[PDB]
Design a binder for these strands. Structure first.
Ligand SMILES: [K+]
Ligand SMILES: [K+]
Ligand SMILES: [K+]
Ligand SMILES: [K+]
Ligand SMILES: [K+]
Ligand SMILES: [K+]
Ligand SMILES: [K+]
Ligand SMILES: [K+]
Ligand SMILES: [K+]
Ligand SMILES: [K+]
Ligand SMILES: [K+]
Ligand SMILES: [K+]
Ligand SMILES: [K+]
Ligand SMILES: [K+]
Ligand SMILES: [K+]
Ligand SMILES: [Mg+2]
Ligand SMILES: [Mg+2]
Ligand SMILES: [Mg+2]
Ligand SMILES: [Mg+2]
Ligand SMILES: [Mg+2]
Ligand SMILES: [Mg+2]
Ligand SMILES: [Mg+2]
Ligand SMILES: [Mg+2]
Ligand SMILES: [Mg+2]
Ligand SMILES: [Mg+2]
Ligand SMILES: [Mg+2]
Ligand SMILES: [Mg+2]
Ligand SMILES: [Mg+2]
Ligand SMILES: [Mg+2]
Ligand SMILES: [Mg+2]
Ligand SMILES: [Mg+2]
Ligand SMILES: [Mg+2]
Ligand SMILES: [Mg+2]
Ligand SMILES: [Mg+2]
Ligand SMILES: [Mg+2]
Ligand SMILES: [Mg+2]
Ligand SMILES: [Mg+2]
Ligand SMILES: [Mg+2]
Ligand SMILES: [Mg+2]
Ligand SMILES: [Mg+2]
Ligand SMILES: [Mg+2]
Ligand SMILES: [Mg+2]
Ligand SMILES: [Mg+2]
Ligand SMILES: [Mg+2]
Ligand SMILES: [Mg+2]
Ligand SMILES: [Mg+2]
Ligand SMILES: [Mg+2]
Ligand SMILES: [Mg+2]
Ligand SMILES: [Mg+2]
Ligand SMILES: [Mg+2]
Ligand SMILES: [Mg+2]
Ligand SMILES: [Mg+2]
Ligand SMILES: [Mg+2]
Ligand SMILES: [Mg+2]
Ligand SMILES: [Mg+2]
Ligand SMILES: [Mg+2]
Ligand SMILES: [Mg+2]
Ligand SMILES: [Mg+2]
Ligand SMILES: [Mg+2]
Ligand SMILES: [Mg+2]
Ligand SMILES: [Mg+2]
Ligand SMILES: [Mg+2]
Ligand SMILES: [Mg+2]
Ligand SMILES: [Mg+2]
Ligand SMILES: [Mg+2]
Ligand SMILES: [Mg+2]
Ligand SMILES: [Mg+2]
Ligand SMILES: [Mg+2]
Ligand SMILES: [Mg+2]
Ligand SMILES: [Mg+2]
Ligand SMILES: [Mg+2]
Ligand SMILES: [Mg+2]
Ligand SMILES: [Mg+2]
Ligand SMILES: [Mg+2]
Ligand SMILES: [Mg+2]
Ligand SMILES: [Mg+2]
Ligand SMILES: [Mg+2]
Ligand SMILES: [Mg+2]
Ligand SMILES: [Mg+2]
Ligand SMILES: [Mg+2]
Ligand SMILES: [Mg+2]
Ligand SMILES: [Mg+2]
Ligand SMILES: [Mg+2]
Ligand SMILES: [Mg+2]
Ligand SMILES: [Mg+2]
Ligand SMILES: [Mg+2]
Ligand SMILES: [Mg+2]
Ligand SMILES: [Mg+2]
Ligand SMILES: [Mg+2]
Ligand SMILES: [Mg+2]
Ligand SMILES: [Mg+2]
Ligand SMILES: [Mg+2]
Ligand SMILES: [Mg+2]
Ligand SMILES: [Mg+2]
Ligand code: NA
Ligand code: NA
Ligand code: NA
Ligand code: NA
Ligand code: NA
Ligand code: NA
Ligand code: NA
Ligand code: NA
Ligand code: NA
Ligand code: NA
Ligand code: NA
Ligand code: NA
Ligand code: NA
Ligand code: NA
Ligand code: NA
Ligand code: NA
Ligand code: NA
Ligand code: NA
Length: 248
RNA sequence: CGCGGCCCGAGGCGGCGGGGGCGACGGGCGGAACUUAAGCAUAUCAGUACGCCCCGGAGGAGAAACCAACCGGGAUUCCCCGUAGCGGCGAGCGACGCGGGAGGAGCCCGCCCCGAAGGCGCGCUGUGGGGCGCACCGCCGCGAGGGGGCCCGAGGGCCCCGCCCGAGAGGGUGCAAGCCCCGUACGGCGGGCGGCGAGUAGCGCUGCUUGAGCGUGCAGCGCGAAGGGAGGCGCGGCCCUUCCAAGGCUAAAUACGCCCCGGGACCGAUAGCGGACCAAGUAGCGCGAGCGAACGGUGAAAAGGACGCCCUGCGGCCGCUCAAAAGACCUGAACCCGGCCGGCCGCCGGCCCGCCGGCCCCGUCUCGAAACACGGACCGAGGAGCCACGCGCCGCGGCGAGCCCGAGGGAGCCCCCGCGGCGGAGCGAGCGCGAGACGCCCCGGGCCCGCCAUGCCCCUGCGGGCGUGCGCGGGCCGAGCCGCGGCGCGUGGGCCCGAAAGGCGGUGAUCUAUGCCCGGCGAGGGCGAGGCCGGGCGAAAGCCUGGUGGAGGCCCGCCGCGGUGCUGACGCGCAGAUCGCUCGUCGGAGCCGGGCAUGGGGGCGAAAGACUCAUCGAACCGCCUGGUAGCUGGUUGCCUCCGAAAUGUCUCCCAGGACAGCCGCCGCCCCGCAGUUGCGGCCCGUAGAGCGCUGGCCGGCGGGAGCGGGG
RNA sequence: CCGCAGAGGCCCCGGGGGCGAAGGCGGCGCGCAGGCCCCGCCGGACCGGCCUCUGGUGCAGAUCUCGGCAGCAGUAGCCGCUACUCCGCGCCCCGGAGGACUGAGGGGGAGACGGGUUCCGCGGCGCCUGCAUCUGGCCGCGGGUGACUCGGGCCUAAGCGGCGGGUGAAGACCGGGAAGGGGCGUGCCCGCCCGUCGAACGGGGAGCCGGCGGAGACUCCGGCAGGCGCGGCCCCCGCGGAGACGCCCGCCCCCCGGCGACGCGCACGGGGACCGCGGCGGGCGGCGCCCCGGCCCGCGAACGCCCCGCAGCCCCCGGACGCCUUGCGCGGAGAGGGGGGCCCGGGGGCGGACCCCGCGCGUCCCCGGCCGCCCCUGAAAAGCCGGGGGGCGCCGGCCGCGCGCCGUACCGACCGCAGCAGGACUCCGGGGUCAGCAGCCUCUAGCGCGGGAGCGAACGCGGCUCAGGGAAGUCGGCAAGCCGGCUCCGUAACCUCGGGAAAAGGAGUGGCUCUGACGGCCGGGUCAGAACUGGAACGGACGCGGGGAUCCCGACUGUUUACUAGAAACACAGCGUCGCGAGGGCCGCACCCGGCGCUGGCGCGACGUGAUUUCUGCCCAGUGCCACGACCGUCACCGUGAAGCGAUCCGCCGAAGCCCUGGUAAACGGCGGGAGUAACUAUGACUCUCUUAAGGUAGCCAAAUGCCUCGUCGGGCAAUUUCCGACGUGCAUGAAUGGACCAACGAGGAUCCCACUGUCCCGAGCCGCGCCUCCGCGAGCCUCCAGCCUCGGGAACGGGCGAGGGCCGGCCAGCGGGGCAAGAAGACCCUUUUGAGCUUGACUCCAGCCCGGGCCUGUGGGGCGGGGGCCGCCGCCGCCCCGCUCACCCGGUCGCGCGGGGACCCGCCCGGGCGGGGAGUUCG
C-alpha cells in the first residue's frame, strides 16, 4: 500500500494552519515585581474578531514599568467586558469580572477562565468560547488548590497560579446548525485543510485498511489496541466500550 | 573602592598558509541487485558496480610482541611454484610457510642524567645536550655515383654499355628510378646499573568480516593489569622454543590514462574511434537529466570551355582546351525505365523451332504441407560455433628411469646458462607398515604388500618371527616427461537476435492534483422572505386588508465554465480527441491570470486506482547490462563412403535431461560361425472339449425313514 | 577437394604489365561439380601460378540492418470560414468603377507572455509561397529602438536564504540564547538578536498640448508646467476669533499617534464621457413626382488664482411630539428654528488661447450617504507627517545650476514536427429593432485567405415540402415534429405550509384616425378606451416550455474515470461512537529536530451512518477491545546459593505478555426443527418433543433482492414473459453492515394517456456541396507468383493437383459475393520449476512501540526478609520507602528586582513481548 491520510498530515505541506491576518497569540500578562507586591492598572482599548477563533479578543494597555511609554497586551475577553473599562492585575486586585489574581485569593465557588497550569505560564486551561473553571477548595497546609475543568475532571494546582474572573465570551455558538455544506466550507477555510472527509470503506485496499470488497464493509472489528503502529491505528483506539449505553 | 601579576577569553593589525581542477594507476569509508544453485530463504555474484573523501610521480608497506620445529632461518615489496581448509559438506569458494630469483639500508622519540648551556618577546607544565660503570637526453651539421638509341601527352618503359657503396631504409618527381631532388651509412658539442609507551592489552555479551574451523581481523557497551605475547581444537597444571605490543621516519626492485616518439602476418570509407570531409561531440532533437547523425576521389597542368550561327529571353547547334571530356567531375554493376530493331508466353526432353510429352511455392516446425499453417514486393552491400583456461581420449616428434625455452642472468627476437614440478610404491580414518614366483603379447590362475580377524614360537616385548582365513586396492625383472595437432565436454556475452522484471545515482508540478498570497470578472428578466406605513374589526389578546421593502449554496437566460444525445460528421482526419446541432450551470462548495509550496514505493486525491508535462495497479534519464531463457525465429561452397531413433529405468519428472539400446570413426587380435531345417531330451495349460472340482441353471420319472400343506 | 584475404619462398641472364594491370559487359572451350581458362568491347595502374604458414574466409530467407527503387497511378486527393466582376493588366499584385463580407465578446485599434529582426527602403524570382505569381513573414544590399516626470533599480506578501553553533562515515542537512551596532566627532552618549533576497498586475514624489520622419515617441522639436537637490544674495524665534477655526511654512532626541491601508450586495443620488433632438453658419448629393423631410463639419488639455459645492461632521443662542428618507433614521448625553466653521477624485470665471446656441432619455465609469450579510470580518512595509516633553536657532523670498544606470522596433510572426478548423491573459466598445451587451441588418475601421472551368447521372453530406392514416415502425417515440413573446381570464390532488404553478386550460395582438390619465413654473414617455379598414391577417423574418398520470433510486445545490462509464457512485448538513487535561494525544523523521499548535474539551484527532417524519428488537457462546482487576501457573537477561582444576552445570529469584476473573454489539458479526389437534371440509388459536449464545421483533416484498417462475388473484388491452394493486413458511427480506415513509429536486432507470408528426403503410419531387469531365498539382496502404468455374481426393471448405465446362486483347462509372482482404508475434483457454498488484489465522523476518536490569549518578536517614527462643557481628546478602541539592531537565524574563522537578526521568548497552505498518519468497 501507500501512506494514509493521517501519515501525510504530520509532514506539514498543505496541512498547516492558515495564520495570515491573525492578531497574535492570546496570553495573560507576564508576572513581574510590580504585581507580585501590589496591583497594575490597565484600560481596555478594543474588542476584536480573530480569524479561526470563536471567542473575541481584547486589547489592553498597561503602563511600562521598566522604562517609558506603554505596553499593549492581548487577552481572551470574558463575557461582559466593554471598551474603556479599567482592569487590575496583581496580588491585591479586587474581585471583579475582568481582573487577574492568584487562585489562592479567589473564594470557592467562583468562575474563572484562562487558568495557568503551572505558575508563570500565562494561561492554558479555559480558553474556548463559553467555557469556565470552578474553584472547589483550598489547602493551606500544602499550598494547593482544587479546580474543576470544563470536561468535568478535577485537578490540583499550586495556589500561586493566576486566573481571570468570569467565563469566556461567545457562549452558545454550537447551538445553531450550520445547515449547508457551504457554511462548513467557510468555517474550515478559516482554520486548516481538513474538510470534506472521505470514508475509508469507500476507498481501495491500497490506501486504507478499510477499503476493498464486493460490498462496502469493515472486514474485522473496528477496535484497535493502544500499541498499534502508526499505519494501523484507525477506527476506535483503545475503546473501553462501544454503543449507546443510555445510562449514567 | 581603585591597580599590578598569573590564568581564561574578546576585537583589530602585519606576514605566511588553505579551498578548486584531473574516464588511468594509489589510499580510506559507505555499499547493491541482475545472475548460479536447473525452484529458493543460508551461500554465490562480490569484500564488484556505483556514491563520498584524500595525496603523488608513484602510492601504500617496512626494520619482528616473525616464521619454524630444522645438522634452522631473519625488515618491506614484486616475479616463478602449489592444497590445508570453508561449504543447505550442495552449487561453489580458497590462503601461507619451505625452495628459486629482482632489489637490498638502516634508524629515531618517550621514559633516565644534566637544567636554559636552547630556535631567547618563546620556554622550567621543560628548550638544548647526553646512557652510566667493566672493557641515456638535447643541439648542430656535411653527405657519392648515368649516358646513347627507340617510342610515348609525360617514362621511373624497352635495347646497349657504365659508375657509387660504412649509403640497394624510405618519400617526391607527367608511367617500375641506388646514380633527377630530399633523405639513408660514416661525425662534433653540451648535459654490573638505570630504563623500555593504561581506560591500554585482555575478558563477557552483541554486530560485521575471513580458508581460519569452541573465533581470521575489526568494532560498540560493561569490566579492567604487571612482567608480557606466540607456537592453525577448547579448559586447568608443569616445561621447552622464540619474541617485546599499546609512539615515529625511510631509497630500490612494482603499477599506470591523457600527451609525445617508434613499430605492426591489424581495418581500408555500411570497415576502422560516434567522428579520414578547412567548421564532430558538430547540425539536429528533448522543460531537463540527456540523445546524437550524413557527407572521401576532375586532370600531369584549371590549361574550368575560343569563334561562329539561330533565339523577344530562356536556351540550342557547331566546334574549342586535353592523350581523353575525365565538363563538377575516377571506374560506373543490379533492380527499374525511354527510343529503334526482331519475337509471342515459365522450366526439362526430342526435333529441320513451334509442336508433342512431363512439371503445384520455396524455407520451416511436424506422424503428415500445394495448403484456407507462418516468413518472403524487388535489387545491392553487410550478416551468425572464433578466442582463453580446465578435464578426458586419440595421432605424431624428441629424449627415456628419467624428463623439463620457469622466473631470471649473459649486451644476439631464432644463440648460451637456468629451480620447483611430474614420474619413479602402495595401502591405510589414523598411530603407520611396505611388495618378486611364474609370462613374445592378451585373458585367467598362483603367489607377495597394506587394511580386518585369528593359532603357535621368542629376543630388546600390546615388540619380533612363522602360519591360516573372506573382501577391497596394489605388485611379480618399472614407462614416463615435454611439445605440436584433432575430437568431445565444462567455465567465460560464449553460434546470432529476443522478455515480463530487480538494483544504483540523478532530472522534472509549463500539463494536471491540492493548498497559500496578490489581482480580475459575472447582459437582461421572474418569484417576492424579514423589517416598515395607512384603513377596518375587537372588552382584551389579537386578527383582516392595500402598500412599501428587496432575502435566497431560488428560477428562465447571454458571454464564460462544462460535456448529455444524435451511439450525427470525421475516422489514409483540419486534429496522436477535432467539427455541427442538441444539452448542463450561470452570485455560489463560482470562474480566470501570475507568484509560491508538496518529488517516485514518494506526492496529491468531494475516491475513478484517478492525476503526477502525448508516459502511472508505481514517472522519466543514464548505468549495472551484450541481465537469464528447459521457449519461438535464423545459421553462408562441391563430390565420395557409411547411416539411425521415436524404446527401458530414474528424475518438483510429463515442450527438458542422465545411464542403457540403436549408429559413425579409430583400431587390435587370431580363438570357427548361423533370426535355418533334420534327429534326440525336457517345459507350458491357450483354442477346442467338458460338467468330475468351485459356482450357476430348465424340467420328467421313481422311493419314501423324517417333516409340512391339504383331503 | 574448389574458392577468398594476408605472410614466408620459387618463377635460368631473373615472373606478367601505358605494345595497356585490377574491375565491368558479351561469347566460346574445359571440369560430375564447386569453379577455371581464353577472345572481343569498355577502363586507365597494378597483378599472381606452384610450395609452406595464418584467418573477422563462401548467404535466398532471420515481421534481418543500411541504401536505392517498382506496380498501384496521372490514381486517392486539393468540401470549414457566403464572392467576385469589367477595364488599365494578369481569377490571386496595383489603380478606378461596381457587388459583398467581418458586424464594437470584431477577421477593428493596442498591451502582457513567448518569438528574436520577422520591422523600413531599394532590387529579385534560384528555393519556398501543396495552382499561378510581376506577390510575400522568401532571397540580396543598405538602415532603424533617444526619458528628472512611463516601467525596472526601492518596499514588503505567501515564501526563500543566512545565522557563534548541532548532527551525520561523508555529501550535507537542521538552528535564538551567542561579548552580535551606531551617533556626534574624539571624548562621551545610546543600543538584546539577520537579508541593497522574493510582485515590468500590490505600495510608490512629480507631465500636458501642438508639430515633425520612411521605419521612434508620455522619450525628438516648440510651448507651457511639476518634483527633488545643490550654490549665492536678502533674510523672521506669532498674531486673530466668543467658539468651531483662520492667517504669513523652525530643526534634533525620547515617547504617543496618523497617512500609506483595503470585503460583498440590491437600490438611491451626483459628476464626466458617449448618445439623441431643435436652432444658426459653412460644404455636398440626388432629383420620373415630392423635398426648409438626405449627408458631412462647427475644436479647447495639464497647470495657477478667485468663487460655488448636496449629503456628512462640528460651534453659538435657547430649551422641545417634532424633523425627515425610495428605504430609513435622529432628538433632554440637547431636537426644530436662526446664525456660523470643516472636508468633498467636482463645477464656473479669468489666464493657458482672439471659446456657435439651447434641450433630453438612456448607456458606461467613478464617487457619496445609508441599509443588509458572515460559526467567513475582508495584507504588510518602505516612506511621509503631526502631538507631548526636553534641547537647540535665522527659515523663508529672489536668482542660478543639476537630475546617473537599464527597457523601448515589430507580431497572436507564440506552442502543437507546418503559413495546422486546436490551445493562448487583459484594455477601449457607435446606430436600428428590442427587456436585452440575445438573435437579425448596419456607420467607423479592415478585407476577398490549399487554384480554377464545365456538366447538372447514381450515391453520399447539409436542408425543404408532401394526399389519407397517425407509433401499426423499433429493444426502446431514437430522429423529427408540436409548444413558445406580451396582456387578460382560470388553475387540482398532495405538502416539510415554504410549494406544487408558466399546473392543467382559454381569449386577444396589424395599419390608420382619435380620446383620457400622470409633472413644471415647456418636457416625457408609459398605461387605458373608441371608430374605420385590410384573402377570417397581425410575437407575419428573428428570437422563443410540448403536457399529464404513476413506480424505483438518491433528500436537496455540488463532484467524478483529460481520450469509450455523469450514475443509483463520492461529498453534504444532521445523528452516534471512541481517545486525550500538556510531564498529554495523534502524526512526521537516518540523526539533530518537527506538524496539529498564533491551539486548550462550545478543542483537537480517529471512525461509521447520511436532510426531514417515525423508529432503531434479542444474543458477550466465537473473534476483537478494555480493566488504577488479580497476581494463580508459565514466562528473559541480570543478580545470588551449592558443586567443580577450570571451562561449566544445577537451584533460587520472576517486568511486561499470555493464562485467570469480569465489562462491552450505533465493535466484527449472528438471530431453529418434527409431530398431533376445533360437530362437513379446510386451517390450526392449543398440546407434546428435540434443541441454541440467541432462536428474526416492528415493519416490508416475486422490490435494482424469489431458484422453482412467464408464481396466483385483480386493473388496464382485441390480444401483454412488460407495468400497477394485493397475497407470502421469504432458494437467500429486516432495523445507524440502518428499517419504513416521504413534499421539493434529477442531461438518473421504467409503464401508460393527450397532442404531434415520413418512425411506418410506401415512397415521390426539389435545393447547395462533393462525386463525374477538363487545365494545373500530385501521395499512402498492400504485394511468393498469379488472378473463371463444378466435382474428386487431400492437413478432412483449392487459383494451381486428377476429370470435365467456359473464356480474343484493352479500359471506364459503380458495387461490396470471394481473394479463409488489411490493420497486432490472441487480451479468452492451457503450459513454463517467467512476473507483478493486492490479502491473510502461508513462512522467514524488520522498523516502531511497551517492559526489566546496568552506565550516566551525588549527599543523608529508615523498614522489611534471608546470613525453644533468639541475639547476630554491626563488616554478609537482597528488596523497599522518605529527605536535601550540586549533576541532569523544564518554564518566565529585553535575565529589571523568580520559579518548577530531581538523582528519578531522558540518552546509551543487553534482554523479553507486541508488531501484513513494511520487506523477501513460495503456493506439488
Ligand atoms: K465522513
Ligand atoms: K563477499
Ligand atoms: K505445427
Ligand atoms: K493464422
Ligand atoms: K595439446
Ligand atoms: K516508482
Ligand atoms: K522423461
Ligand atoms: K459341476
Ligand atoms: K516591481
Ligand atoms: K518606443
Ligand atoms: K459525518
Ligand atoms: K467475549
Ligand atoms: K433475497
Ligand atoms: K385481467
Ligand atoms: K442526474
Ligand atoms: Mg471505487
Ligand atoms: Mg493492507
Ligand atoms: Mg463494489
Ligand atoms: Mg588576518
Ligand atoms: Mg552477469
Ligand atoms: Mg535460481
Ligand atoms: Mg534457469
Ligand atoms: Mg526465479
Ligand atoms: Mg568471497
Ligand atoms: Mg611511503
Ligand atoms: Mg646527396
Ligand atoms: Mg624512389
Ligand atoms: Mg616499546
Ligand atoms: Mg563471508
Ligand atoms: Mg600445538
Ligand atoms: Mg618506493
Ligand atoms: Mg565511419
Ligand atoms: Mg525446349
Ligand atoms: Mg505440356
Ligand atoms: Mg524453425
Ligand atoms: Mg515446438
Ligand atoms: Mg498438427
Ligand atoms: Mg513445405
Ligand atoms: Mg555478403
Ligand atoms: Mg608397471
Ligand atoms: Mg547474445
Ligand atoms: Mg537482451
Ligand atoms: Mg527480486
Ligand atoms: Mg514551477
Ligand atoms: Mg503552473
Ligand atoms: Mg442576495
Ligand atoms: Mg442556482
Ligand atoms: Mg458518431
Ligand atoms: Mg470516411
Ligand atoms: Mg515521506
Ligand atoms: Mg548405405
Ligand atoms: Mg523429489
Ligand atoms: Mg473355451
Ligand atoms: Mg595515370
Ligand atoms: Mg581480416
Ligand atoms: Mg541477400
Ligand atoms: Mg480527382
Ligand atoms: Mg453582414
Ligand atoms: Mg504594437
Ligand atoms: Mg514587411
Ligand atoms: Mg530573410
Ligand atoms: Mg513613476
Ligand atoms: Mg525611473
Ligand atoms: Mg527585492
Ligand atoms: Mg504598482
Ligand atoms: Mg520635458
Ligand atoms: Mg511604431
Ligand atoms: Mg512601440
Ligand atoms: Mg517542441
Ligand atoms: Mg491557429
Ligand atoms: Mg409496436
Ligand atoms: Mg414490430
Ligand atoms: Mg428526441
Ligand atoms: Mg443527487
Ligand atoms: Mg446537479
Ligand atoms: Mg472518459
Ligand atoms: Mg460521457
Ligand atoms: Mg416476521
Ligand atoms: Mg418475497
Ligand atoms: Mg408487484
Ligand atoms: Mg421488476
Ligand atoms: Mg407496452
Ligand atoms: Mg439474511
Ligand atoms: Mg441493532
Ligand atoms: Mg441488507
Ligand atoms: Mg489461393
Ligand atoms: Mg490441372
Ligand atoms: Mg464500397
Ligand atoms: Mg468482399
Ligand atoms: Mg502467440
Ligand atoms: Mg502477445
Ligand atoms: Mg516441468
Ligand atoms: Mg512475486
Ligand atoms: Mg506481504
Ligand atoms: Na579538497
Ligand atoms: Na602534481
Ligand atoms: Na567505394
Ligand atoms: Na586515377
Ligand atoms: Na504433397
Ligand atoms: Na508460429
Ligand atoms: Na507478408
Ligand atoms: Na599377468
Ligand atoms: Na438555473
Ligand atoms: Na475497481
Ligand atoms: Na540489455
Ligand atoms: Na578482366
Ligand atoms: Na564473420
Ligand atoms: Na472598391
Ligand atoms: Na448581437
Ligand atoms: Na457537521
Ligand atoms: Na459474513
Ligand atoms: Na502491477
Amino acid at each position: 500500500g501507500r501512506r494514509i491520510r493521517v501519515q501525510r498530515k504530520g509532514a506539514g505541506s498543505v496541512f498547516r494552519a492558515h495564520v495570515a491576518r491573525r492578531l497574535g497569540a492570546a496570553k495573560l500578562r507576564a508576572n513581574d515585581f510590580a504585581e507580585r507586591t501590589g496591583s497594575v492598572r490597565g484600560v481596555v482599548k478594543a474588542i476584536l474578531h480573530d480569524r479561526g477563533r470563536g471567542a473575541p479578543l481584547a486589547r489592553v494597555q498597561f503602563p511600562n514599568m521598566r522604562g517609558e511609554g506603554r505596553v499593549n497586551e492581548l487577552f481572551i475577553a470574558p463575557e461582559g467586558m466593554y471598551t474603556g473599562q479599567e482592569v487590575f492585575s496583581g496580588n491585591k486586585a479586587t474581585l471583579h469580572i475582568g481582573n487577574i489574581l492568584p487562585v489562592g485569593n479567589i473564594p470557592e465557588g467562583t468562575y474563572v477562565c484562562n487558568v495557568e497550569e503551572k505558575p508563570m505560564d500565562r494561561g492554558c486551561l479555559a480558553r474556548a468560547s463559553g467555557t469556565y473553571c470552578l474553584v472547589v477548595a483550598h489547602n493551606m497546609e500544602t499550598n494547593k488548590t482544587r479546580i474543576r475543568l470544563p470536561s468535568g475532571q478535577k485537578k490540583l494546582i499550586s495556589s500561586k497560579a493566576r486566573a481571570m474572573i468570569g467565563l469566556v465570551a461567545g457562549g452558545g455558538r454550537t447551538d445553531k446548525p450550520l445547515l449547508k455544506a457551504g457554511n462548513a466550507y467557510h468555517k474550515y477555510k478559516a482554520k486548516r485543510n481538513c474538510w470534506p472527509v472521505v470514508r475509508g470503506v469507500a476507498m481501495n485496499p491500497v490506501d486504507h485498511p478499510h477499503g476493498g470488497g464486493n460490498h462496502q464493509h469493515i472486514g474485522v472489528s473496528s477496535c484497535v489496541p493502544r500499541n498499534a503502529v502508526p499505519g494501523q491505528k484507525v477506527g476506535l483506539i483503545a475503546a473501553r466500550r462501544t454503543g449507546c449505553s443510555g445510562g449514567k
